[PDB]
Amino acid sequence: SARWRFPARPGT
Amino acid sequence: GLKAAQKTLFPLRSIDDVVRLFAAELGREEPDLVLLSLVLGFVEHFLAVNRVGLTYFPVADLSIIAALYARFTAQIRGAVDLSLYPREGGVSSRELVKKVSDVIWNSLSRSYFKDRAHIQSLFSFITGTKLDSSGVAFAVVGACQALGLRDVHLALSEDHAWVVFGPNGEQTAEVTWHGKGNEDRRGQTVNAGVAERSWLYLKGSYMRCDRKMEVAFMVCAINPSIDLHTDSLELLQLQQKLLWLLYDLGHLERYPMALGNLADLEELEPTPGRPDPLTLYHKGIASAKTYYRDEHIYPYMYLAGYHCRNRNVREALQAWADTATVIQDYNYCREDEEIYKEFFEVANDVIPNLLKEAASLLEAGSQGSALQDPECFAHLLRFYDGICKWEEGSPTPVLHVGWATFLVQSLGRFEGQVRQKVRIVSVPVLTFQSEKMKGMKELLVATKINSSAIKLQLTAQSQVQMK
Numbered sequence: 001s002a003r004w005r006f007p008a009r010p011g012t
Numbered sequence: 013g014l015k016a017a018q019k020t021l022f023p024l025r026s027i028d029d030v031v032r033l034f035a036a037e038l039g040r041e042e043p044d045l046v047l048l049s050l051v052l053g054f055v056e057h058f059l060a061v062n063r064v065g066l067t068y069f070p071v072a073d074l075s076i077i078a079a080l081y082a083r084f085t086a087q088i089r090g091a092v093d094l095s096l097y098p099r100e101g102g103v104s105s106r107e108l109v110k111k112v113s114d115v116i117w118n119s120l121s122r123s124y125f126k127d128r129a130h131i132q133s134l135f136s137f138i139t140g141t142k143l144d145s146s147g148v149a150f151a152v153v154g155a156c157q158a159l160g161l162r163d164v165h166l167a168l169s170e171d172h173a174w175v176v177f178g179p180n181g182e183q184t185a186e187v188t189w190h191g192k193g194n195e196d197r198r199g200q201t202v203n204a205g206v207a208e209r210s211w212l213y214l215k216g217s218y219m220r221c222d223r224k225m226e227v228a229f230m231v232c233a234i235n236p237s238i239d240l241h242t243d244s245l246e247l248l249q250l251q252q253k254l255l256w257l258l259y260d261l262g263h264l265e266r267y268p269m270a271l272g273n274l275a276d277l278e279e280l281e282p283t284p285g286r287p288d289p290l291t292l293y294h295k296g297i298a299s300a301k302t303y304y305r306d307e308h309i310y311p312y313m314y315l316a317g318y319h320c321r322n323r324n325v326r327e328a329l330q331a332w333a334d335t336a337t338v339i340q341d342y343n344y345c346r347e348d349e350e351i352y353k354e355f356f357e358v359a360n361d362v363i364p365n366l367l368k369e370a371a372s373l374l375e376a377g378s379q380g381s382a383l384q385d386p387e388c389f390a391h392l393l394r395f396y397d398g399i400c401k402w403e404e405g406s407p408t409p410v411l412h413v414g415w416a417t418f419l420v421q422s423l424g425r426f427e428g429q430v431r432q433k434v435r436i437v438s439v440p441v442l443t444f445q446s447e448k449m450k451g452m453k454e455l456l457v458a459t460k461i462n463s464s465a466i467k468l469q470l471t472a473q474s475q476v477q478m479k
Contacts, residue, residue, distance in 0.1 A: 002060075002129035002239050004144045006171055008232035008269035010276070010314045011354075 013085045014078060018047060022074035027250045030055060034254055038261060042223045045154040046134055049230050050080045053135020056234060059244045061130050083138050088155045091115045104161045104177045106185060110199045113187040116151045132233045148188035149173035153226060166221040166229060169214045170310050171350050174202060176220055194347055210345035217307040224263040228270050231255060252277040266303045271296035272314030279318065289318060309338050309351060320362060325370050325382035329391035332358055336398025340445060344406035352410065355399055360418045367425040386433035389426045390440045393449065400446035416467040428459040
């Protein structure tokens with residue numbers, strides 16, 4: 001399932 | 013509540029029509045954050061969340077978009093009565109900003125997963141009553157714009173969001189949560205966090221957005237992920253086009269992370285005639301040095317990751333060394349765990365894997381190997397020195413014996429004859445800032461690295477086993 005990350009934080 | 017001029021490009025029938033809309037708004041006195049976030053959320057919903065029936069692009073009809081816009085503006089205008097909160101000077105009050113924050117917060121579903129994808133936009137707020145952490149802060153700023161509160165702006169660190177407002181733009185307010193099982197400070201300033209010298213508040217060298225940088229934030233907040241192994245090409249393209257629009261207009265000049273995101277997109281699919289990824293990573297680092305006192309970590313992490321993916325060992329190590337040279341001047345505090353996790357993963361997974369492969373390729377006869385370059389060994393040591401110095405004076409420790417096993421392993425990937433070439437000079441040549449690394453210096457050139465002594469020096473452990 002797809003997750004949230006802080007916008008434009010590098011990496012995956 | 014849209015103006016006639018804002019409606020003339022609908023219906024939006026392609027990526028380029030969405031870009032035209034963004035161009036037209038960015039050319040207005042103030043771009044309409046509510047309109048733009050609804051459009052992005054709409055197109056993201058139908059390109060990433062539910063693609064049933066997609067044939068090219070989800071056409072955004074004005075009737076649909078205007079109805080969503082009216083639900084938002086109705087909700088905020090009905091719930092926030094401005095007469096109760098008089099505005100002298102074109103400046104908003106803390107009570108008003110808290111009221112708007114409360115209206116957004118109290119509108120959210122009582123229970124939901126906050127770490128889900130695609131809950132960042134006002135489309136998600138209206139249709140699902142769900143937002144992610146930073147999405148709440150953006151929504152508060154959108155609602156304030158809808159109310160005419162021109163002084164309310166988004167503030168961003170590398171892992172959190174809040175608002176600035178008030179006389180001269182100098183007031184700060186927390187409007188959303190951070191992290192998980194952390195304690196909510198909504199309404200409060202960020203001054204204690206700045207004073208503590210935590211990474212989360214960047215020693216005060218955080219981004220203070222204007223409305224065009226708020227547009228950049230929403231564009232960075234686009235999430236092309238359909239699931240863990242597939243991205244939407246359409247949304248990647250849209251993001252990339254919108255970032256270039258913003259770039260050309262000057263609106264990424266003070267936004268290092270956005271320049272990094274753009275560089276990453278160019279690596280995946282380069283746009284003819286544009287700067288190379290490396291150029292863009294270096295622009296991001298230059299933006300952090302110019303505007304933010306070189307106090308940001310992610311510009312160097314972005315760079316280091318590019319080098320790592322391209323198996324540029326020397327340049328990756330250099331860039332992670334530079335990451336650590338930034339963090340050394342922070343105190344590791346309670347809500348900085350995301351950056352701890354980042355450094356942990358670099359030290360304890362990514363560098364080891366890179367060096368393991370380099371060791372195999374050296375065995376295979378590679379020339380100019382990082383493992384034969386004493387400058388590379390110096391970057392490895394600068395990386396650890398910055399992390400050790402970070403830990404100094406911090407309310408919470410950083411290093412533990414889990415790190416020491418990897419340090420010994422990594423050191424050991426360089427032959428003693430390479431290691432011996434680095435001269436460690438006191439205040440290649442390297443100066444250490446940290447007391448831990450200064451004490452480790454003699455141990456760093458032995459043919460056989462003394463693993464137990466290294467462990468003792470890196471950690472709080474001071475004794476060996478009794479038996």
